Amino acid sequence: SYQKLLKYYVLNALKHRPPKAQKKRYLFRSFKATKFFQSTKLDWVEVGLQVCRQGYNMLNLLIHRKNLNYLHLDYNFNLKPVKTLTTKERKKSRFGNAFHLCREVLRLTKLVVDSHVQYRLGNVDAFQLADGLQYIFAHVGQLTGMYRYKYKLMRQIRMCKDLKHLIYYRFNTGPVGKGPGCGFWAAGWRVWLFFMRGITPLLERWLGNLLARQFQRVESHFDLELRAAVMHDILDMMPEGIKQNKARTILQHLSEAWRCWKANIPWKVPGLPTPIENMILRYVKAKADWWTNTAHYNRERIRRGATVDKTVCKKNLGRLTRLYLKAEQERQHNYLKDGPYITAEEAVAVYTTTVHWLESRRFSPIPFPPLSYKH
Amino acid sequence: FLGMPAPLGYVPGLGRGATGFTTRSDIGPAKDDEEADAIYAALDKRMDERRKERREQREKEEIEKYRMERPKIQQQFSDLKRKLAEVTEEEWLSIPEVGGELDMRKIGQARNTLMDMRLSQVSDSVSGQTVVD
Amino acid sequence: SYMLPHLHNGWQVDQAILSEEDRVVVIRFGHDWDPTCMKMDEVLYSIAEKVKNFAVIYLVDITEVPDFNKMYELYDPCTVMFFFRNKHIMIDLGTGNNNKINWAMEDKQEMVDIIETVYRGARKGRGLVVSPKDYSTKYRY
Amino acid sequence: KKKTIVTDVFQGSMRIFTKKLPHPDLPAEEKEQLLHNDEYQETMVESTFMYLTLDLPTAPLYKDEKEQLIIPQVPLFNILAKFNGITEKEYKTYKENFLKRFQLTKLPPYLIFCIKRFTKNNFFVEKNPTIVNFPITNVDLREYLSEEVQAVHKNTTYDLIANIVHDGKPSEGSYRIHVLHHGTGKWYELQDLQVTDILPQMITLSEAYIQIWKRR
RNA sequence: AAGGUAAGUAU
RNA sequence: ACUCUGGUUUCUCUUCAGAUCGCAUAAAUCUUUCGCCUUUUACUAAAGAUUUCCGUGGAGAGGAACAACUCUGAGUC
Numbered sequence A: 001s002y003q004k005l006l007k008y009y010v011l012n013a014l015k016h017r018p019p020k021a022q023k024k025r026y027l028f029r030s031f032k033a034t035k036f037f038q039s040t041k042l043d044w045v046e047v048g049l050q051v052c053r054q055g056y057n058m059l060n061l062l063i064h065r066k067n068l069n070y071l072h073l074d075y076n077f078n079l080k081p082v083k084t085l086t087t088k089e090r091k092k093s094r095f096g097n098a099f100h101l102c103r104e105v106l107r108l109t110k111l112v113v114d115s116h117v118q119y120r121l122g123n124v125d126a127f128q129l130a131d132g133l134q135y136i137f138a139h140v141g142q143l144t145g146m147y148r149y150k151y152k153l154m155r156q157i158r159m160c161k162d163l164k165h166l167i168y169y170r171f172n173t174g175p176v177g178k179g180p181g182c183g184f185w186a187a188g189w190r191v192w193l194f195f196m197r198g199i200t201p202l203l204e205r206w207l208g209n210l211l212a213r214q215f216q217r218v219e220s221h222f223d224l225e226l227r228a229a230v231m232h233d234i235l236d237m238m239p240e241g242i243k244q245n246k247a248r249t250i251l252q253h254l255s256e257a258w259r260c261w262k263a264n265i266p267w268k269v270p271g272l273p274t275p276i277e278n279m280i281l282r283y284v285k286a287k288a289d290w291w292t293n294t295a296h297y298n299r300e301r302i303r304r305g306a307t308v309d310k311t312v313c314k315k316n317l318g319r320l321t322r323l324y325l326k327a328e329q330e331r332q333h334n335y336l337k338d339g340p341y342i343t344a345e346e347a348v349a350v351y352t353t354t355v356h357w358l359e360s361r362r363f364s365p366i367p368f369p370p371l372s373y374k375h
Numbered sequence B: 001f002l003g004m005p006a007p008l009g010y011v012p013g014l015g016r017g018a019t020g021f022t023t024r025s026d027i028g029p030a031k032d033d034e035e036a037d038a039i040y041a042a043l044d045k046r047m048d049e050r051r052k053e054r055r056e057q058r059e060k061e062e063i064e065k066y067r068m069e070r071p072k073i074q075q076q077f078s079d080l081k082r083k084l085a086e087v088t089e090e091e092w093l094s095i096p097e098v099g100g101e102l103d104m105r106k107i108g109q110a111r112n113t114l115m116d117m118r119l120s121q122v123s124d125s126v127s128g129q130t131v132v133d
Numbered sequence C: 001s002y003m004l005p006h007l008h009n010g011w012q013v014d015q016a017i018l019s020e021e022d023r024v025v026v027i028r029f030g031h032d033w034d035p036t037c038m039k040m041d042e043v044l045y046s047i048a049e050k051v052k053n054f055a056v057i058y059l060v061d062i063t064e065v066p067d068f069n070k071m072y073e074l075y076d077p078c079t080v081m082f083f084f085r086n087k088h089i090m091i092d093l094g095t096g097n098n099n100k101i102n103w104a105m106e107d108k109q110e111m112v113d114i115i116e117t118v119y120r121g122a123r124k125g126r127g128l129v130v131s132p133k134d135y136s137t138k139y140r141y
Numbered sequence D: 001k002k003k004t005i006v007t008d009v010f011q012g013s014m015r016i017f018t019k020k021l022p023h024p025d026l027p028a029e030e031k032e033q034l035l036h037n038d039e040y041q042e043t044m045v046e047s048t049f050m051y052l053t054l055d056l057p058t059a060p061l062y063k064d065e066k067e068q069l070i071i072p073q074v075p076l077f078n079i080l081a082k083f084n085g086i087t088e089k090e091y092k093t094y095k096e097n098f099l100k101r102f103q104l105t106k107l108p109p110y111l112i113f114c115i116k117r118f119t120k121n122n123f124f125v126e127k128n129p130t131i132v133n134f135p136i137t138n139v140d141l142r143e144y145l146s147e148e149v150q151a152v153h154k155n156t157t158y159d160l161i162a163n164i165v166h167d168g169k170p171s172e173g174s175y176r177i178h179v180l181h182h183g184t185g186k187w188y189e190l191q192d193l194q195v196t197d198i199l200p201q202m203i204t205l206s207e208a209y210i211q212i213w214k215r216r
Numbered sequence E: 001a002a003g004g005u006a007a008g009u010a011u
Numbered sequence F: 001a002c003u004c005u006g007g008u009u010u011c012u013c014u015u016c017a018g019a020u021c022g023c024a025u026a027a028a029u030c031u032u033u034c035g036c037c038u039u040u041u042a043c044u045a046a047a048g049a050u051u052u053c054c055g056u057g058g059a060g061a062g063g064a065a066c067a068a069c070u071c072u073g074a075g076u077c
């Protein structure tokens, strides 16, 4: 526990630089100044029960917003169906993971407030109040099981156990019993306060989304950008106010040009204007460069070990085949133009060595297929 | 029926006779209110204005730096579209709707001929050289 | 480059879907400027020539026609609703929402098979139909 | 002696009357307004131009004559086209289409031409495989650049003393050069293995990385 | 959290 | 020993962050690797770069409250 908590502390110490040159816009003070809210003074327990009632109202509206009575949230912030929910009704009554987090945190604050309420209304003494506070702060994982609601919260709860591990260790260090009588809740209380402070932006954003009324693409994106930009440039140059149909047929040549590049076959269209041909050449050179780049990049990704899909693998294989076919084409052309690379008299020397070795072996060379053969 | 006006006075959702595809709750939304919405939006804007200026300046600087490395798609052919209008009207009108350097192979042929001649000359030393008929 | 027919008005899409006979009306909700939706539109364009006999594709813009956003819960990109025979079909492909395809198909042939299966199911009269390829897994490995 | 001997040997001077021509997106009215504002006015650059940088034309996207490989050999006049072709350049990578209007005023006795075949595309840097097609003989680009400078530049017959050409793929590539002794004119390859190679042997066929010539 | 709504038929 | 010297509590408002903004410490997105791997919610765990988020300081401004008590240095004292 000590080693793990020291790890957490040192990781906190590593990344510590605030860029936050804020304008000191006190949003809370502005909300206080808003006419929709007013200020007063009241006891902390009264504020706690007010917040519990407000959270229950929040969950009540969030649940029965679509007039669905399938799911019911109890006053203890535990959701429960009113009957054996139908599978279609179960699909209808479903909430996201962040809603699970919100319900869990509301449950935690409600149970803390109710514990202080029962303490104030006599019942159990204050020593046990502190002990129960300590336990709840260091057993939220067991109490609420945030694991499913959020995986990261597990870290908080597990470290809370670690701090509690130390707290009880020291509390029960000597004459103090080895029982559950430990009361140092602040150590986990601060951690839970920090984690809640980190979480609350998400809950606020989602609650605002509900309160409002609006509650593999990179290669495809670049291809669409290329084709759309070229089409828009053509429609700017080509007077759509006069000619309409032929522009669509223009796209055909685009595709033709593209496949004319893929097949590595000559492409000449005398009917098309020369500036149009130049624009097509620029488009096809950009597309070919991008296509080869992404082809070799995806091939490298596949061979490295990255997981790929069947269609993506087939497309990458096709692109690699096309690229290799092209490359072999200019390689053969370069061999034809530059001639054989066998140096003069060097292949002759190799042949002389071979024939000398064969003569040393002194074997009869294989003749033409005879009329009569053994088998 | 593309290109037709929509007769007003009828709700498209109700007239078609469709059923509410309730995929999942809490996934869809399902004047004093206007004034409250305006006030809350103003409060949200006030809260967000704490870091807006510096973030916007940094984003603008980053975008400007990114543009130099690689500009927009239409930027690579801005000159071409500038010169695109130079084509005559009759040029694109008749667009077909249907879809020096000597013989470098001479050096290769000479090299191949020289190699073949050298091999044929070396074939004389091959006492056991054989052919077919 | 997004040359498929698009519903300028919301009511126009409604009557276009209503004006169907022995054909499947694939209404692709979303926005053309989205990149994933651009890929989906390109796939639909590729399919359109091959299956134009019974499959008609008719895109629409959420901003242009927001009245149908809440009707079928249109709050994701690349959404596709096979509104065929004036009946929203139940296409099940191993997903939670078995009435909406909200991501561009990896391959065109898969989309062609899906749309022809939808046509067969609609012609048979059933309101639900399954897919030969389950999409619960993306076959990433 | 501010003018360094190495610098002054290959200094040069280009009187590029650079014009800040309006951006292509500017309409005809905006172009007229900019012209009235002297935006497109030619301004002399007086560029040092220590070594001339001549860029090869566009690569052949589709091979027409021979589908296996099309080599668009660039005539040596393209380098000599800098008198007017560079003076007619109206292109820039910025938003405004800058008109270079390059005009080489004083040609240095040593001419170092850089082909700059390598160029970065939108994804990767590629090299144009176009043949150099540059004969090794007298040149008249200095007279073309400035007709009156012919009196000052009496020895305009410059022979390509040393030409270096890259070879292989852009990633794993090498270089090979051929140089001629001044006066002797051996024109031999500087490669250690091929020490003696006088004939061009399709020297201009390869993409010559750079050339160096003397006015003599 | 989920990846687990059979559709059909008129009320 | 003589003349001028002149508040601190506060409330907000607008800027700038140097300063371990904070002798405390979260979260979100994106990016590269690691366990990855069964699709997203997610993860594991580190790095890199942002953002929100709890807070704070400097500086300036405007009212209230102690504004009349001066603190204090200067004024050869």
Ligand SMILES: O=P(O)(O)O[C@H]1[C@@H](OP(=O)(O)O)[C@@H](OP(=O)(O)O)[C@@H](OP(=O)(O)O)[C@@H](OP(=O)(O)O)[C@H]1OP(=O)(O)O
Residues within 6 Å of the ligand: A168, A178, A179, A180
């Ligand atoms: O389950 P673990 O984390 O291993 O710890 C538990 C338990 O902890 P929880 O109360 O958090 O479940 C007790 O701890 P406390 O009751 O002291 O809080 C108990 O401890 P005591 O016996 O001291 O009561 C005991 O630990 P141990 O028996 O080792 O002292 C036990 O651990 P085990 O499950 O390993 O027995």
